[PDB]
Design a protein around this ligand. Structure first.
Ligand SMILES: CC(=O)N[C@H]1[C@@H](O[C@H]2[C@@H](O)[C@@H](CO)O[C@@H](O[C@H]3[C@@H](O)[C@@H](CO)O[C@H](O[C@@H]4[C@H](O)[C@@H](O)[C@H](O[C@H]5[C@H](O)[C@@H](O)[C@H](O)O[C@@H]5CO)O[C@@H]4CO)[C@@H]3O)[C@@H]2NC(C)=O)O[C@H](CO)[C@H](O)[C@@H]1O
Ligand SMILES: CC(=O)N[C@H]1[C@@H](O[C@H]2[C@@H](O)[C@@H](CO)O[C@@H](O[C@H]3[C@@H](O)[C@@H](CO)O[C@H](O[C@@H]4[C@H](O)[C@@H](O)[C@H](O[C@H]5[C@H](O)[C@@H](O)[C@H](O)O[C@@H]5CO)O[C@@H]4CO)[C@@H]3O)[C@@H]2NC(C)=O)O[C@H](CO)[C@H](O)[C@@H]1O
Ligand SMILES: CC(=O)N[C@H]1[C@@H](O[C@H]2[C@@H](O)[C@@H](CO)O[C@@H](O[C@H]3[C@@H](O)[C@@H](CO)O[C@H](O[C@@H]4[C@H](O)[C@@H](O)[C@H](O)O[C@@H]4CO)[C@@H]3O)[C@@H]2NC(C)=O)O[C@H](CO)[C@H](O)[C@@H]1O
Ligand SMILES: CC(=O)N[C@H]1[C@@H](O[C@H]2[C@@H](O)[C@@H](CO)O[C@@H](O[C@H]3[C@@H](O)[C@@H](CO)O[C@H](O[C@@H]4[C@H](O)[C@@H](O)[C@H](O)O[C@@H]4CO)[C@@H]3O)[C@@H]2NC(C)=O)O[C@H](CO)[C@H](O)[C@@H]1O
Ligand SMILES: CC(=O)N[C@H]1[C@@H](O[C@H]2[C@@H](O)[C@@H](CO)O[C@@H](O[C@H]3[C@@H](O)[C@@H](CO)O[C@H](O[C@@H]4[C@H](O)[C@@H](O)[C@H](O)O[C@@H]4CO)[C@@H]3O)[C@@H]2NC(C)=O)O[C@H](CO)[C@H](O)[C@@H]1O
Ligand SMILES: [Mg+2]
Ligand SMILES: [Mg+2]
Ligand SMILES: [Mg+2]
Ligand SMILES: [Mg+2]
Ligand SMILES: [Mg+2]
Lengths: 269, 262, 267, 261, 260
């Protein structure tokens, strides 16, 4: 793509808003939607087979954009260029719930609040003009992922660190495990991604929300993601931490993510 | 609303406080606290009693009356402060001791989750309904969506509300709607856990600008300014290990100017 | 006050210390500490003994003569334009040998645990006394006669009650846990505060002579020194000191102030 | 002592590279990315950390295109720790949160973070310094032998350059601030054994490598020198045995032609 | 010292200050304190020599000069060196799972105290102690029998950092009432199980100019460097704890300044 002039004026700019619900593992429209199933742990890397529902996967959607009024006789085409976004983790308010079926602070005394959601936070989003380009990488290569998940089967010892053969693209919602795929910094020339990990099992979650924050999506040449086939590609994972039951069974809890994206008309060859 | 020129008498300032609504009734000995928190055994039998959970504070401030083309009050800046941070230096009032097994040491003080948010707009705060457990039965006193469905545990575009009453919208069931609130600025921070150290700052030297990307502040519909907040500081722990929410009141100063509208 | 021109002899600087008022008597062996903290069984029978809780430090500093224009309708006031402030004695918290509960008390071993727990650090610079809001954790707390409080303040005193006001007019007698800065007043004071809670929380303190804070408001006007007085207030709870027998006391540190003032004309 | 003249303009090039971590366990075998299980000595006197139980620095020389002489001058970089996503695994053979109840997630990776990278026109210049000078390092490791009590703090004689991948122990060597005129280095250490790892990743961050005179690293022999270490924390087995876990690091470097004397 | 114009004219010095944590230099525990013992009351409190850290300090000789010229310190780089060593969790450390004799060592944990000073004369100190009844040993420079007011600020209790390795950190800090010709910077993070957090780079330069554009002016052609760098505690299997310290790098850039 040879990139040419920005279009300005009051037809040249549009705004889309979208949500991505989390895919922590439990099925939609059922009582544990937003949670994983209770996590089971292997005894050894050789006998490691995490059941479907017990691990989070990436959220993704393609957003169909408004009609561009293309010039019928020009040797150029217009594309939508994503220039800025707002993104917010929604439902942070729910984490003030320390009554719902939670292990108590003073369990020996059957007293105190629930311990609430605690432990690892993994928060990442991507805005691009094509699917997010992935690097496959796993803690344990010998892990057997379920039929329901999309992974590289028998990926070999090299998949525990960087191996340039082990590539993917985030093409489906809810089936790419977070623990087996990450953004590929050798690609994503037409996507912006942002991620933060805070680990632990008892770490306090820290989340902010405001409707006053905007992130510019322009690269060093002042070019934003260019939406190929007039699609905008949104991706995220938002693990807030763990929910712990009275019997000490632990599940992942996720929150949905809001996106507002401003796009403008860019001429290309 | 089509926005025209700033009218440059044309500047006013309001100060207001919102007291916390942590659950216990006002003018009684536990005002500013919740009642002691009980925990359900399972999501299917989860009915948090009234007084045991915090709700949002809200107030509408009446502004000087104004009025082809109307004048509206435009919120351009604010100061906000969590008041009474000084009270948290109290480690003597009926608190579990650091060395309970020795009947020695200070109180452990207030500890655990901090949830701090405020909003300033020209109409009520627009809410998104979302809950940890959709099967929670909220008490008659609370404003909620009843039988909200599994979908309410994440984002459901059907589950909307507005913050139209003080002390009855449960914090755990409602948050700001980023799909709306074009005429409101909101800010919030959550720090989780039950033994987390509270971190609070206060100064009369910080001003936040409320103008959007187009230089437009909140425009006060019907000459009303809408202030909203929740300020959970953490939990108070008794000797017998019963735990309650403690809240603090919030100060607002808002500066407004007259703006011409079509 | 109607504020006019700034003079550019025009500038002066004062330095001062405020020593902490943690509860134990001055120039006795526990100076800089509270007495060992006791805890009530219920809010109804809560009566914290004098010495076992910290109080605000305040001083009024006398400023140099202003050399007024005898015939002018206007007067000169000192305007505070900037400060440095530093908690002094941070060096002392490297002490883990002085009568402290040990890290491994079951083995009678390791360093002392040193000072840990809540940090409350606030300072105020103004041209009149700091204006305070009364607010308490428990309204039924009976404060001792030595302390300045609103008596029988009632339930509303657990949150914001616009009736419950005061001003910081004496050093070492206004309990930190009962009074805070009033954001509805203090037009002529700048205040700054940080609270970090807990009882095992590590103290975090920084010190440098390279930091200046500007005291000018949004109009370019600093605090104006009425009666040619500069008013300094602070509290610097560093955390708790824990004895081998697990008795716990507040430890405080003194605060340094440098304030740059200039001559302002007013009407 | 290189006389630097004018910037050229064909005159700009970009490289991308990965450095795999060197935490101790051998490449292309089941524990790649990890150390072996850490053993602890009883005293400084009898302290011999076995090969495979401690991390070493990663390093690589990138061959630039061949070029008053011209040199490649490194003006900017992006760097990223990759595979942060894998740390969401709490099922792979990990001690459980509630071991006494055989319940909960794995405890995951926790403890010390040590994150450092260097980009230079010559090998990174090193200062030898150790917690305990009486440590006997294994034959596979590159160390100063019998370094003396002075090697527990700064001793100006104890110098080195990072000239080999995977054999300079992190606990024995660090960047020399007395040298490295032709290298930019950055690091952070967060200690503890139960500390939560904190890691960020984005493709949107650029670091300018120009010094206070507007000069970037000048690539001697048309080579670019990349170095790092990325200890994320410890992996803890059910039997409480602990290993280092590391992650690979991404480098993008932008270079331009500089005229030199 | 009335200051005139800036002015061959620019020089740069580098130096290191080794830590003075308490154990003798050139011996096996160099960089550590001896194992810390704890008193039962403030009355009987007498910390033995080697069990507490002291400030490090050096005077650097500048090219001799000489309407007089003076060396003016305008900027610096400083760096805690040897941060790399803290990745050692094998050297005679209490283990994470001591009941199971398993896990890594717990490594260095607890209070960090990091301070440096750059000036044209010795750092000016305020004497302040946790416990005034502490009897410091003969080897240490203190104010003897300082009294109850020494627990807080007493304006009589002053000193200057004139010797390396004998001013106890816990007895002396920088005096904000003086030090007009010194820039100091410090941070304290307390606790005994706190994680150390240390950063290092060769890319960071700090400007030493005051509000008037004047850097430290080196009286007698001497540059004064001071520091303390307590990283945390080393814990043995038997749970004996010592301070561990790290050396500090200094780069200072100086220019000639005319004075009267
Ligand atoms: C992640 C995973 O799947 N972990 C499972 C695995 O644990 C083993 C691995 O972590 C490997 C990785 O190198 O380390 C073993 O630990 C060994 C290893 O560190 C070794 C040196 O490389 O030192 C110790 O072992 C000692 C000695 O070197 C061993 O040869 C020896 O082995 C003997 C066994 O004890 C006998 O039972 C066997 O009959 O004969 C051999 C001798 O040929 O034991 C020495 C003991 O000090 C480390 O222990 C890990 N092993 C263990 C036990 O943690 O496999 C284990 C089960 O073995 C679990 O499934 C674990 O989840
Ligand atoms: C801060 C302070 O001074 N607190 C002291 C106080 O604690 C009580 C308060 O914290 C109040 C604040 O609401 O809450 C009590 O706990 C109750 C309460 O939360 C209640 C619902 O509002 O739920 C439980 O109580 C159950 C039931 O609702 C009660 O009616 C009941 O009451 C019976 C008692 O069991 C009998 O002993 C009594 O003689 O008869 C009544 C029946 O009318 O108990 C039910 C639970 O078994 C909560 O417990 C606080 N109470 C306690 C015990 O913590 O007063 C206590 C001593 O009572 C301490 O001094 C405390 O420091
Ligand atoms: C939050 C809440 O209301 N929890 C109460 C509930 O707990 C159960 C739920 O958390 C569900 C969520 O899917 O999990 C049950 O745990 C199960 C599942 O994770 C299951 C796989 O889907 O794996 C385990 O069960 C297996 C097997 O699948 C079962 O058929 C068999 O009966 O037991 C097997 C034992 O491994 C796992 O236990 C939760 N059950 C328990 C128990 O925690 O209901 C319980 C009481 O039953 C409590 O009321 C919770 O508070
Ligand atoms: C890192 C290491 O290898 N540690 C092993 C070492 O421990 C000893 C060292 O840590 C030295 C460092 O100076 O201290 C020993 O502790 C002694 C000293 O601190 C001493 C004052 O210098 O005070 C104590 O001892 C007194 C007396 O002073 C001694 O002379 C007398 O013999 O014993 C007295 C008993 O109170 C203090 O204990 C460390 N010793 C011990 C023990 O921890 O050597 C030990 C073997 O002893 C272990 O192998 C450590 O891992
Ligand atoms: C730092 C140090 O050297 N501490 C040693 C010291 O401890 C005593 C000091 O902390 C003083 C400081 O004021 O307080 C003692 O505790 C007392 C006081 O808080 C007192 C009120 O002022 O209240 C308690 O005492 C009451 C009563 O007032 C006493 O007269 C009566 O005998 O006991 C009452 C309680 O039952 C409180 O205990 C500290 N005393 C003790 C004990 O901790 O001296 C002790 C030995 O006495 C140790 O050496 C400490 O390390
Ligand atoms: Mg590329
Ligand atoms: Mg909208
Ligand atoms: Mg006012
Ligand atoms: Mg050099
Ligand atoms: Mg002075």
């Amino acid at each position: 793509i040879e990139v040419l002039a920005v279009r300005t004026g009051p037809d040249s700019i549009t705004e889309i808003e979208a949500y991505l619900n989390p895919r922590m593992g439990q099925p939609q429209n059922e009582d544990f939607y937003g949670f994983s199933d209770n996590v089971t742990v292997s005894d050894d890397f050789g006998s490691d087979a995490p059941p479907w529902k017990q691990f989070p996967c990436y959220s993704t959607a393609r957003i169909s954009l408004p009609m561009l009024n293309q010039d019928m006789t020009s040797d150029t085409i217009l594309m939508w260029e994503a220039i800025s976004c707002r993104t917010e983790v929604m439902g942070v308010n729910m984490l003030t719930n320390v009554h719902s079926a939670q292990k108590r602070v003073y369990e020996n005394d059957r007293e105190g609040t629930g311990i609430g959601v605690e432990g690892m936070g993994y928060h990442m989003f991507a805005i691009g003009g094509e699917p997010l380009e992935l690097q496959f990488m796993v803690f344990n290569h010998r892990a057997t992922y379920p039929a329901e998940a999309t992974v590289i089967k028998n990926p070999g010892a090299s998949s525990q660190v960087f191996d340039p053969n082990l590539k993917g693209t985030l093409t489906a919602d809810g089936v790419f495990p977070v623990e087996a795929w990450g953004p590929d910094p050798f690609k994503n020339e037409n996507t912006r991604y942002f991620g933060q990990y805070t680990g632990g099992t008892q770490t306090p979650p820290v989340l902010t929300f405001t409707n006053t924050q905007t992130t510019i999506l322009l690269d060093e040449n002042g070019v934003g993601p260019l939406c190929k086939g007039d699609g905008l590609f949104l991706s995220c994972a938002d693990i807030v931490g763990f929910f712990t039951q009275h019997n000490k069974k632990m599940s992942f809890r996720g929150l949905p993510r809001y996106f507002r994206v401003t796009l403008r008309k860019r001429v290309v060859k």
